[PDB]
Design brief:
The structure is cut from a larger assembly and holds chains A, B and C.
Chain A lengths: L26 E5 L9 E2 L1 E2 L6 E3 L4 H4 L7 E5 L7 E4 L5 H10 L9
Parallel strand pairs in A: 4-6
Antiparallel strand pairs in A: 1-3, 1-5, 2-4, 5-6
Chain B lengths: L13 E6 L6 E6 L6 E5 L20 E10 L4 E5 L5 H27 L7 H14 L9 H10 L13 H12 L20 H9 L13 E4 L5 E4 L9 H16 L8
Parallel strand pairs in B: 3-5
Antiparallel strand pairs in B: 1-2, 1-4, 2-3, 4-5, 6-7
Helix pairs in contact in B: 1-2, 2-3, 5-6
Chain C lengths: L4 E5 L7 H7 L20 E9 L13 E2 L9 E2 L8 E10 L7 H8 L4 E7 L7 H13 L4 E7 L5 H14 L10 E3 L8 H10 L13 E6 L17 E8 L2 E2 L3 E9 L9 E13 L2 E3 L1 E2 L3 E7 L14 E4 L6 E12 L25 E6 L2 E11 L2 E12 L5 E6 L4 E9 L1
The chains are: A alpha+beta, B alpha+beta, C mainly beta.
The structure holds one RNA strand.
Subcellular location (chain B): Cytoplasm, Stress granule
InterPro entries (chain B): NA-bd_OB-fold (IPR012340), S1_domain (IPR003029), S1_IF2_alpha (IPR044126), TIF2_asu_C (IPR024055), TIF2_asu_middle_sf (IPR024054), TIF_2_asu (IPR011488)
Family (chain B): Belongs to the eIF-2-alpha family.
Chain lengths: 109, 266, 422
Amino acid sequence: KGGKNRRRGKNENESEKRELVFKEDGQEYAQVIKMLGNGRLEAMCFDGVKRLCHIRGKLRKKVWINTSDIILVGLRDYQDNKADVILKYNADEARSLKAYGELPEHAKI
Amino acid sequence: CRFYQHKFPEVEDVVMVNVRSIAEMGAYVSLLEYNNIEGMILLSELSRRRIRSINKLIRIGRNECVVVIRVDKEKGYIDLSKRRVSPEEAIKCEDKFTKSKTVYSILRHVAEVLEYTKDEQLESLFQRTAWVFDDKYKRPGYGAYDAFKHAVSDPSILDSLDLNEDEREVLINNINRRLTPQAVKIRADIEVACYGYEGIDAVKEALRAGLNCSTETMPIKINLIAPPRYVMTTTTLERTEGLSVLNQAMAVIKEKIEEKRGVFNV
Amino acid sequence: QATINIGTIGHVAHGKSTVVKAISGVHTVRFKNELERNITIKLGYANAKIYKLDDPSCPRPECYRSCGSSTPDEFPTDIPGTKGNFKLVRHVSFVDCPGHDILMATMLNGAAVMDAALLLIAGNESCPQPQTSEHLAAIEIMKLKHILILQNKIDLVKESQAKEQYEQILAFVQGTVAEGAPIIPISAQLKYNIEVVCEYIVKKIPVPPRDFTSEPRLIVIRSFDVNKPGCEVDDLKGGVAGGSILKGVLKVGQEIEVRPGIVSKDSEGKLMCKPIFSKIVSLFAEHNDLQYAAPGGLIGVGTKIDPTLCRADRMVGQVLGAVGALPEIFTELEISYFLLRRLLGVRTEGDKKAAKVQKLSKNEVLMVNIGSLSTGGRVSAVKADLGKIVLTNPVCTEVGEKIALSRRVEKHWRLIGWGQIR
RNA sequence: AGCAGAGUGGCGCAGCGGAAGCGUGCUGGGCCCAUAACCCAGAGGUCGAUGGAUCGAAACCAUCCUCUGCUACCA
C-alpha cells in the first residue's frame, strides 16, 4: 500500500529470513498460470500435470501472490483436479532452488 | 538598433517581442520589433480561458505576437496585450520581423567599414536610407526589401538616391544569392496518339519550334515523362513573360502531328 | 539468327529458369520482376548458339569443364571436352510458353509459330496429368510431331513413381504421336544428362523446309519496350515487334503491313478495317546485327510504328504481310469444326470432372484461336459442320489452315475442339 | 526513371531563414495518509557528401549520392 493507516493494529512483521522445506510427499512446487478472482486461483505443477490451486487460511489477505512465480502446493489426498496451496516462497528463494537443481529448469521469472 | 521605420509603436498595431523575464503581474518584455525599449504585458489580457500550466504558455526566449494597447509617448511606457491576436496577424508580423532582420543585415555591411565605435552609427544609416526606400512603398504593402529587390533586377532604384561604395557588390551578391535560384514552373501539357510512322521526325520539327521568333540556337529543357506526354520547360524568365511561350506552343505540336495522319488530342 | 523454334511448354511446378538457362543460357523474363509466383506465366523469349567440339555435348564459352551452381548440396560437374575453339552448328531459338492452365489461349498462340517442342513433365503430381495431353493434342493439330518429352522434375521423385507417370502418359496418348518422340529423364537440381539432350535436339529436330522465295509473312506475338529512355523525345523512333517469320525472307528497309487493321471512325456495322503500314528500321536477332530475316526464326523487327502500339502488350497474335498482302481480313467467318468427346485440359485424381460437353448454342461467346490470333466471337448460326461466327476485332486469315475452339466452362475458357476455315 | 520526403541529440513523427521542433516515452522530483489525475526537472552530439552567400546552416540556397513514399521503365 501507499502508507495510509489502520495498518498497524496487527503484527508488523516481516520475514526475518528463512528457510526452507520442499516438496514433501504430495506437497510440491508449482507455478501460477492465471489469476482468477473471488479467491481461488490457477497454477500448473512443475511435473507436467496441471491442477487448480486453492488458497489457505492466514495467507488469505496476509500475503499477496501476484501472477507468475513459484509456489508450494499440497495435493489433496484423494482429489486430482483441485489442489491446495501452502507456503509460497520468495523469487530469490526460487532462483536459489533452481541453481541448486532440485526443481525442474524450465520456467523463467 | 531600431528595426522599424518609426522608433516608437502606435496604438492598436501588431508587434513582436521577445520575453526576457516573467513578472507576477504579467510579463515585462523587450521589443525586437522596434528598439530594445521596454513594454509591459499584463496577466488579465493574455487569454479568455483558464490557465493551468504557465510555462507551457509564455516563457523566456520566445518571440510572441502582441498588440500595443496604449503608449506613454513622453515617458516611454509601452503597454502591451496578447488578448487580441489572430494567426493571420502572426503571418504578417513574422514576415515583417524576418524581412527587417535581413534588411538590417544588409544595412550592417555598411557599418562594418564606416565609423561605428558608437551604437548610434546604425541609427544614422537607418534613418537616411531606409525611410526613402520604404515610405514611398509602405502604402502599397512593401518593405525596404522590395526596393532592394527591384534594384538588383533593374539598377536605377539605388542610383536614384545616394549610392554607397563597396556596398554595391555585397548588396548584389546577397540579393542575387538569397532571392533566387530563380525559377520557372513552366511545364508544357501535350497529348498525342499517332497512327503515323513519320511521327518521330514530325515531333522533332515541332519540338524545336516551342518559341516562335527565336534563333535556331536557343537552349531549352526537353523532358520525356511518358510516351504521349511531351513536356517542354520553355525559356526561363519569371513565368509572367513566358506565358505566350507556354500557351501558343501547345497548339504547334498538336497541329503538326494531325497533318501527317489521323486524329489527335487537341 | 535462328533456324528452328523449339518450345518449352510444361505444367505447373517443374522449374523453368533452371532448365531454360541450361539449354539457351538466356533467362526467361518479363513484366513484374519481382520473379514468378511459381513458373513463368508470360510468353518468354530467348535465342542461343549451339556449337560442337565434334562431340554430341554442347560447350559453354569456357569449354574445358563446367561446374554448376544449381545447388550447394553437392557439386554437379560435366565435361564437354577441351579447348581450342568449337565449330558452330547452328543458331537456335526458343519459345517459352506459359505453364499455367488459365493462360491456355496464350499458350496456344505462342505454340502456333514453333517448329518443335519440349514437353516438360513434373513427377510431383498426377500420372496422366491434364495439361500434358492438352499440349500434345494441340501440337499434332497445328502440324508438328517433332517432340522430345523431357522429365524435368524427378530430382526427389522415386523411380517407381516416375516410371508409372511416363507409362500412363504414353498409354493415354495412344492416338496422338509420341512413340517416335524420345523421353529423356534429366536432373534440374544437378543439371545431369543435359549433354545427351544436345544430341537429341540436333537429331529429332533438323531444319524443316523453309520457303525463301515466297512472299514475307511475319506473325507478331510480343510487343516492344520502345521507347522512353534518352536522349531526345518524345514517343519513339519507333516500335519493335517480337515475331517469328514462317514464310519468306524479310529484307531490311522493306515496308510491312499489319493486316487485321484498325477500324474506321464512326462505324455503324462491323466493317471497315484498314491495315497500318510501317517501314522496317532494323532486323535484330540474338545480339548480332543482320541485314536479312530468314524464315524459321524469331526476330525483333523494329518498324516505324509509334510508342502507343508497343507501350503494353497489344500486338499479341497479329499477322503482318509485306506489303499489300493478298490474305483476306474477315470480320465474320465460316468455320468448319469438330469437337472432342472429352473435355481437354481438365481431369483430376477423382472423376470430377471431365466428360462429354454438350453441343454449342447460338449467341454464346467463344474464343477462336485462328493462326496466332486470339479473337472472341459469337456464334450466329450453329449447324454441326457449319457454324458462322462474328468476331469482335477482324482476323487476317493467311490460309485456311487450322483453328482451335474453346468454350467458357467456368472461370476461364477450356479447349473443346478444332477444325479448319472454309 | 517523373514527382515527394528524409539521411536524430532518448523514442516516433521529421519543424522553421537562431544550434533538437512537435507529439510521446523513460527516469527523478512535487502534491496527497497513499494511488490515480495534475505540476515540474532531464540527455557527451556539422543531423549522408561536395560547394556558395552568410555571424552561422538538418534547417538560407545550390551541386551530387543513397534509402523509401506515390507514379512507373530502362534493365
